């Protein structure tokens, strides 16, 4: 038989994350925009949640960038806004969702460019 729990699945205790990176890390759920350089829209389809950016100090010996934040390069991809919000809640990371913004329909017709008076 099933048991009842109203407790938001929080599994922060099982994930195995250091305390500092669960209480000081804000992740943003956003649908990636399109670099204006290209006109393809296949990278503006799935929602992604990305952890907040952290220190990137220069390395003294070779000048390479060096980072102390483990969750930096991690960007998880989630198909829908609801599912991504769920991941933040059970993992205990703070979230600030940004609504998808899709190009509004625009009316175009080759005839217009040859308008008597535009």
């Amino acid at each position: 038989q099933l048991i009842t729990v109203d407790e938001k699945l929080d599994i922060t205790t099982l994930t195995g994350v250091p305390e500092e990176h669960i209480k000081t890390r804000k992740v943003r759920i956003f649908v990636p925009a399109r670099n204006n350089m290209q006109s393809g829209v296949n990278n503006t389809k799935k929602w992604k949640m990305e952890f907040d950016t952290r220190e990137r100090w220069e390395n003294p010996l070779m000048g390479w960038a060096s980072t102390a934040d483990p969750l930096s390069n991690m960007v998880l991809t989630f198909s829908a806004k609801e599912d991504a919000i769920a991941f933040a809640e059970k993992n205990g990371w703070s979230y600030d969702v940004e609504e998808k913004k899709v190009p509004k329909p625009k009316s175009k017709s080759y005839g217009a460019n040859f308008s008597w008076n535009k």
């Binding site: 599994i11 994930t15 195995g16 102390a68 991690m74």
Partner: protein
């Protein structure tokens, strides 16, 4: 373009129906890839029953367990997708039975059905965190003795959170939070243009 024989996509397809009919209480979906591979999908409760039927049925003997793995689709409510690939040396065919398990909803263990799984199930617990009831001895296999966190989860940082160095003061190896001298350069590679309808 690879050569494809539809003899198999028909044979395997039929078998799929046969399995489904025989085990309708658990089989949810049964598909054959365009690569001629069958992939019965079963409710997690059907782990024991569906495997056993395949290990011990005259018309479908699937004696050895090729592999037990768990893809992790973070989006999917049931995060893990335990996949069991089996081989039938009698009928020279392989099938894959895949179930879904969430982080804290354990799956049954099949060590009974195939003892090959004794190790792979420990491997799935160590890397992904799925738990297997009735397992003889579930304990980390691949990770370090004191490792905290399940590594192959998509939500675990590659570099991880701890690294080891020898400290003279304490004359013993000592973890420290990871500090990397050239972070993994995360090249974005997806192109903004699709390839086909698929």
């Amino acid at each position: 373009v690879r050569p494809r024989s539809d003899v198999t996509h028909k044979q395997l397809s039929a078998f799929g129906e046969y399995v489904a009919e025989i085990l309708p209480k658990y089989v949810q979906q049964v598909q054959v890839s365009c690569l001629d591979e069958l992939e019965i999908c079963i409710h997690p409760d059907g782990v024991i029953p569906t495997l056993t039927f395949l290990r011990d049925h005259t018309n479908a003997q699937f004696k050895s367990l090729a592999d037990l793995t768990a893809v992790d689709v973070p989006t999917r409510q049931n995060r893990f997708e335990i996949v069991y690939n089996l081989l039938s040396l009698r009928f020279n065919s392989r099938i894959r039975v895949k179930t879904y398990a969430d982080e804290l909803t354990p799956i049954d263990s099949i060590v009974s059905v195939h003892i090959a799984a004794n190790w792979y199930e420990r491997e799935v617990w160590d890397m992904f965190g799925v738990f297997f009831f009735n397992h003889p001895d579930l304990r980390r296999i691949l990770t370090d003795y004191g490792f905290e966190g399940h590594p192959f989860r998509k939500d675990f940082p590659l570099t991880g959170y701890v690294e080891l160095r020898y400290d003279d003061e304490v004359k013993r190896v000592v973890a420290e939070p990871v500090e990397l001298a050239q972070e993994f350069r995360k090249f974005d590679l997806n192109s903004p243009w699709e390839a086909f309808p698929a």
